[PDB]
Ligand binder design. Structure first.
Ligand SMILES: Nc1nc2c(ncn2[C@@H]2O[C@H](COP(=O)(O)OP(=O)(O)O)[C@@H](OP(=O)(O)OP(=O)(O)O)[C@H]2O)c(=O)[nH]1
Lengths: 403, 90, 19, 65, 101
RNA sequence: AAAGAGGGGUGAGAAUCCCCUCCACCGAAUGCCUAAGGUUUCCUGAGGAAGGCUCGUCCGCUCAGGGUUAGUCGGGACCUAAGCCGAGGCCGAAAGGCGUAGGCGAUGGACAACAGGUUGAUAUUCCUGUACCACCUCCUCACCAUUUGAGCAAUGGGGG
RNA sequence: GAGCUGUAAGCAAGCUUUGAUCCGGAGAUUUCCGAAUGGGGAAACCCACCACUCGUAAUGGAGUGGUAUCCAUAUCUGAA
């Protein structure tokens, strides 16, 4: 949904020049790449990653006109898209599933990254998308309000939150937590671990002790996307002093650059598994490097009863499959239209639910005063009613043309 | 002569697309083109091996707008048919 | 095109189809 | 661009840029006919460029003879 | 055409007599010029791209250029024009003074 | 000039439009190929202001897309009849008329593909199987002789 | 010296004070028929020869330039 908006803005005007011109020249690719290189540098992408990326794209883009003279510029875009995709990890990296339940997932990171919130988001995702039965664990004893924060999120999910207070070691908390999860048949155990503002020795000593007693199948670093290269460095230090298997990037809804997301793989070899997209518990999505690459480049992929079904499936029934979300991402690339219904759509739905069942079955049976009364009940005098009838006639004509 | 200006523009139709699926491509060539040089020009530009070139030419449709009674220009449709195990044409 | 017709109907319901 | 065409060397690279330019034009017409070309002044400017680079060749030859 | 796009025009003739305005568009083929604020007319239109509402719309109609005089910058009063080379490009010297435009 | 009748279907609207079931007409044709001619009328999706000796939702009308595929079929890259033009020429107030060599000119001569399948519109033309005619040599095989010459024929005789 | 892609009300795109569109003088290209002129032809078409280039193993195919008649001059050959 969210992220990278600033890099896109920059790239997409240089992309404009090449896409329109089918012809590929030595000077054209050089020029596009100079702009691409400046945009990646200003987005705080790792410096070595930039210089390697500009090299591999430019090499492929001048054998590509030799590759193909058909749709040549649209070929240059496909190379950039393919390299952006590899740069953010090849393909979706799915959650591990232990051979024997429970799967123990360790959440680590620095204070303020979003550990505690993301723990709750991941539990939520495991139950809704995968039909799992998770358990949250309170292993950060070093701040007050930390436990109560997790417990509060747990009460909104109806999921247990294991805690022994703040006078007991996190090694013991993790141990008992995992054994209760075995006895009571919980699929997943999510450990919310400690952390101050900066790494120290007595953070890593504790985290290695917890890994030891817990033998986790996944160790996720939760890291703030808006910190750019500082996030890449936090990743490097965690991956070296214990083992990371994954990364959760938080606060993409405030990250217009994307430096961290374009750099984590190449510097640490750790894959990005999820993105946080907001404060609520349901703002977590799997990281899909194709679709972000496509995003960055502006590249995509009974009349009354039918109206009621369209209103149900369009207003609150959003959620397509078979790459429907991928081709419809960003309003299907905007579609050259800057107007959304919103309250206009709400008024259209209110005008739609202004007629009887017979009027819904036969829309042409309404007399002039017959839907003058309906317009008085709806709020638009004749304008909304006649626009709705014109739209229904246009939809009928389109259905007759399609059939 | 130049191999580029032999082939003017392609034809995109449902019948044309069925011929694309059956591996015979269609083009529109200039009105004085030749079967041999359509074959030579498509082999020169696209680097594929052909079996046949099947050329017809079309008369002009008579189109009127109001008082004006003109005729659309003539076209020479040229179907090339590629070999087995050759590169496709995009 | 049933999917294209459904997308056009959704666009007309959201705002309006081009005529 | 005409001063650039005079100022560049005489014999062959005008022909190479005519040839290279011609391929782009051929590609460009195909894109317009299939209907997914965005900008249409490119066809016009490539045609004007081909015309001026041919007329610099003929002006050079009639000056040489 | 004695005026240019971006002048400080005071109109002479019409219903709108004697009001200020800046030229946004000159149409020298028809000798009409579009001064802002004059000939405010009501256009009816059913389609409008970028979120159709239809409705009446208030626009400006062009006026003929002989209902137009530019302004002398020193006194602010309208005057005729003249042309004089100021060591380089030609400039429009307004009458009754020596300054330009 | 002549035979329709009823039930469904669409539409705002029908005897007139589409489907069905009976009935009737032509059948050395009112059937099937194909010339001269016409020039897009052919096919599909829409329209009903004009054209339709009435209506019309229908069309040989109106709008937008599409559709005519050849070595063998017909004509050229082969021949000639009547006839026409005609280098030089012979005439003739001027323009021009006639005419030799030469050429043009099928309604004739010669000449290599056919039987099955296909789509809304093309089919000895596209697809499948099996062929045939003219020409060419990076090649493979046999024979002859590279001057007491193998082989080829020419716009010339002769048979046809 | 600031509006312009005609007629023509069009945004799918772009060009211009590093001087566009517009106006004048001199240049370049100027397909094909047409006295039409390589041969024919039913106007806008068909079929060639020679020389040099492109391509094929070669035949097929293409490009460029010559190829009408009469007259004047010059050269060669000059039949019964
Ligand atoms: N917009 C957005 N916010 C996220 C996201 N993930 C986490 N946060 C916010 O970051 C802040 C830290 O979250 P915690 O869950 O406490 O992280 P921690 O355990 O690592 O310390 C929280 O709000 P906070 O403390 O109130 O933030 P602030 O007031 O310090 O700025 C949280 O709402 C995300 O994906 N999008």
């Amino acid at each position: 949904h969210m992220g990278f908006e600033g890099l896109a803005d920059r790239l997409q005007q240089t992309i404009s020049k090449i896409r329109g011109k089918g012809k590929v020249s030595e000077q054209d690719v050089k020029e596009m790449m100079r702009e691409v290189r400046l945009a990646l540098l200003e987005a705080d992408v790792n410096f070595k990653v930039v210089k390697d990326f500009v090299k591999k794209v430019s090499e492929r883009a001048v054998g590509q006109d030799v590759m193909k003279s058909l749709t040549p510029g649209q070929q240059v875009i496909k190379v950039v898209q393919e390299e952006l995709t590899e740069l953010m990890g090849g393909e979706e990296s799915k959650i591990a599933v232990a051979k024997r339940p429970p799967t123990v997932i360790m959440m680590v990171g620095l204070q303020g990254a979003g550990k505690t919130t993301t723990s709750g988001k991941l539990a939520n995702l495991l139950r809704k998308k995968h039909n799992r039965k998770p358990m949250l664990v309170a292993a950060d004893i070093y701040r007050p309000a930390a436990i109560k924060q997790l417990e509060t999120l747990g009460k909104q999910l109806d999921m247990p939150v294991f805690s022994l207070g703040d006078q007991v070691s996190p090694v013991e908390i993790a141990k008992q937590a995992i054994e209760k999860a075995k006895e009571e048949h919980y699929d997943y155990v999510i450990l919310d671990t400690a952390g101050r503002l900066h790494i120290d020795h007595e953070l890593m000593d504790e985290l290695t002790n917890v890994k030891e007693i817990a033998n986790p199948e996944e160790i996720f670093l939760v890291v703030d996307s808006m910190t750019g290269q500082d996030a890449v460095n936090v990743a490097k230090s965690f991956n070296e002093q214990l083992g990371l298997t994954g990364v959760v990037l938080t606060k993409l809804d405030g990250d217009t650059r994307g430096g961290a997301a374009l750099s984590i793989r190449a510097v640490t070899n750790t894959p990005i598994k999820f993105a946080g997209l907001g404060e609520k518990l349901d703002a977590l999505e799997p990281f899909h490097p194709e679709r972000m690459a496509s995003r960055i480049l502006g590249m995509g992929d009974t009349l009354d009863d039918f109206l009621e079904q369209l209103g149900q499936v369009r207003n609150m029934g959003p959620l397509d499959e078979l790459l429907q979300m991928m081709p419809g991402a960003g309003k299907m690339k905007g579609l050259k239209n800057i107007q959304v219904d919103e309250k206009q759509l709400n008024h259209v739905e209110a005008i739609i639910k202004s007629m009887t069942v017979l009027e819904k079955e036969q829309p042409d049976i309404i007399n002039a005063s017959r839907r003058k009364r309906i317009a008085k009940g709806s709020g638009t005098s004749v304008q909304e009613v006649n626009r709705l009838l014109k739209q229904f006639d246009e939809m009928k004509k389109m259905m007759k043309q399609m059939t | 002569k130049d191999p580029r200006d032999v082939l003017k523009r392609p034809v995109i139709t449902e019948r044309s697309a069925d011929l694309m699926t059956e591996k015979k491509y269609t083009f529109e060539v200039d009105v004085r083109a030749n079967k041999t040089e359509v074959k030579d020009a498509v082999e020169s530009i696209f680097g594929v091996k052909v079996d046949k070139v099947n050329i017809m030419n079309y008369k002009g449709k008579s189109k009127r707008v109001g008082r004006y009674t003109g005729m659309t220009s003539r076209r020479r449709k040229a179907i090339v048919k590629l070999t087995a195990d050759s590169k496709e044409i995009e | 095109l049933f999917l294209v017709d459904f997308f056009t109907i959704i666009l007309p319901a959201l705002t309006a189809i081009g005529i | 661009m005409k001063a650039n065409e005079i100022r560049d060397l005489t014999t062959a690279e005008i022909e190479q840029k005519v040839k290279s330019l011609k391929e782009e034009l051929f590609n460009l017409r195909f894109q317009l006919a299939t209907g997914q070309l965005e900008n249409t002044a490119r066809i016009r400017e490539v045609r004007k460029a081909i015309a001026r680079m041919k007329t610099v060749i003929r002006e050079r030859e009639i000056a040489a003879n | 055409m004695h005026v240019k796009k971006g002048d400080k025009v005071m109109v002479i003739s019409g219903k709108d007599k004697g009001k200020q305005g800046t030229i946004l568009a000159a149409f020298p083929k028809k000798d009409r010029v579009l001064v802002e604020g004059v000939n405010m007319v009501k256009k009816h239109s059913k389609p409008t791209q970028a979120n159709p509402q239809g409705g009446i719309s208030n626009q400006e109609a062009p006026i003929h250029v002989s209902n137009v005089m530019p302004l002398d910058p020193k006194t602010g009063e309208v005057t005729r024009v003249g042309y004089k080379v100021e060591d380089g490009k030609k400039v429009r010297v307004a009458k009754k003074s020596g300054q330009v435009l």
